[PDB]
């Protein structure tokens, strides 16, 4: 369950060299750091560990996207060493590399205290065990060359800590070649699983999940999980025309036509007819005649329809209310995709009167998990490696943990 892995404060620190994984992967442009959110969040396991005593406190993570080849001038995590130590208000120490003989020496034994950033480890492809050449041609790890990789960073540290939720749903190296006598877990993804892992095994109820989306296909295997433990279940986004496209025969003019609609969603309907549980739908939209924030906004409802070449973007008012009805009634609220087009300040009545309706519910007790500040209960932030767990498949990063 969630009691099962081991976690930083868990663990005796005093004099052990911590080797941690974290999230570094912030927007860059141009060697500038954008956004250095995901590097003020890591802080606090850092912080935790140096405040315990930590020896050393080496830190590795990719940023970019290398795919195997190393890209000093591009994807190079200095920027974050800098960005680091000024946050820090101490001096972290930055190595040009992740692997190998002079990286292995320089955390054998650092000064009790010392804070060393390791090169992006993304610029080997022993990491993730495919990449791409300086020519495109996609490569595979030697089953070898990964053991060695795995190896090398596994001598530099004393306990092994995975703070990088994110990425937990890879099989990579530093998810799991680690080989230390404990492989606990940050804060951050702590935090993560204990949310999780509650939607997942006792749920408060009753238990809504508001599942947004589009590709109907890349999202049935998310909402047949869920199914499983939610009472309600709002779906939202351009998914849902494939369903009113059949259930109600509804006309979608032009928003996006989906293939195998068909067959799937009377399949996720069935599922949720057997387990009881009711799935709600947007009644009514707000409709738009060109894919683009500065379109001549437009209405619809189901019975009436979306015009030759209109389309919703936003669902209207009287679904609105009707989210206002579920979402005032649960206990554990887990929301999973876009609502709306809410990054154009026209079609975002939907999405942002909802955050309202789950606000208002958090101070009313409930348990609020959005997926993308404490006015919610919990903010998940690894994307990928979320979804992999609310569609009921495991995360290799996790099990790779010390059991308790």
């Avoid at 050449?133 to 960073?153: H, N």
């Avoid at 296909?217 to 059949?246: C, R, S, W």
Wanted: glycine share 10%.
């Amino acid at each position: 369950a969630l009691s099962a892995k081991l976690t930083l404060d868990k663990v005796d620190l005093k004099g052990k060299r911590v080797i941690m994984r974290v999230d570094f992967n912030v927007p860059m442009k141009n060697n500038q750091i954008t956004n250095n959110q995901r590097i003020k969040a890591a802080i606090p396991s850092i912080k935790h560990c140096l405040d315990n005593g930590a020896k050393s406190v080496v830190l590795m993570s990719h940023l970019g996207r290398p795919d195997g080849i190393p890209m000093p001038d591009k994807y190079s995590l200095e920027p974050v060493a800098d960005e680091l130590k000024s946050l820090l208000n101490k001096d972290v120490i930055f190595l040009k590399d992740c692997v190998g003989p002079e990286v292995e020496q320089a955390c054998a034994n650092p000064d009790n205290g010392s804070i060393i950033l390791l090169e992006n480890l993304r610029f080997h492809v022993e990491e993730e065990g495919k990449g791409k050449d300086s020519s495109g041609k996609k490569i595979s790890a030697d089953p070898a060359k990964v053991e060695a990789f795995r190896a090398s960073l596994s001598k530099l540290g004393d306990v092994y800590v995975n703070d990088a939720f994110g990425t937990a749903h890879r099989a990579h190296s530093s998810m799991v070649g680690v080989n230390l006598p404990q492989k606990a877990s940050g804060f951050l993804m702590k935090k993560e699983l204990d949310y999780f892992s509650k939607a997942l095994e006792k749920p408060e109820r009753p238990f809504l999940a508001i599942l947004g989306g589009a590709k109907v296909k890349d999202k049935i295997q998310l909402i047949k999980n869920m199914l499983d433990k939610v009472n309600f279940m709002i779906i939202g986004g351009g998914m849902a025309y494939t369903f009113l496209k059949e259930l109600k025969n509804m006309q979608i003019g032009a928003s996006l036509f989906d293939e195998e609609g068909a067959t799937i969603v009377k399949e996720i309907m069935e599922k949720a007819e057997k387990n009881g549980v009711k799935i709600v739908f947007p009644v009514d939209f707000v409709t738009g005649d060109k894919f683009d924030e500065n379109a001549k906004v437009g209405q619809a409802t189901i019975e009436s329809g979306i015009p030759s070449g209109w389309m919703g973007l936003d669902c209207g008012p009287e679904s609105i209310k009707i989210n206002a009805q579920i979402v005032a009634q649960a206990k554990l609220i887990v929301w999973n995709g876009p609502i709306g087009v809410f990054e154009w300040d026209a079609f975002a009545k939907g999405t942002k009167a909802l955050m309202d309706e789950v606000v208002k519910a958090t101070s009313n007790g409930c348990v609020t998990i959005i997926g993308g500040e404490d006015k919610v209960s919990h903010v998940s932030t690894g994307g990928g490696a979320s979804l992999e767990l609310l569609e009921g498949k495991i995360l290799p990063g996790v099990e790779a943990l010390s059991n308790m």
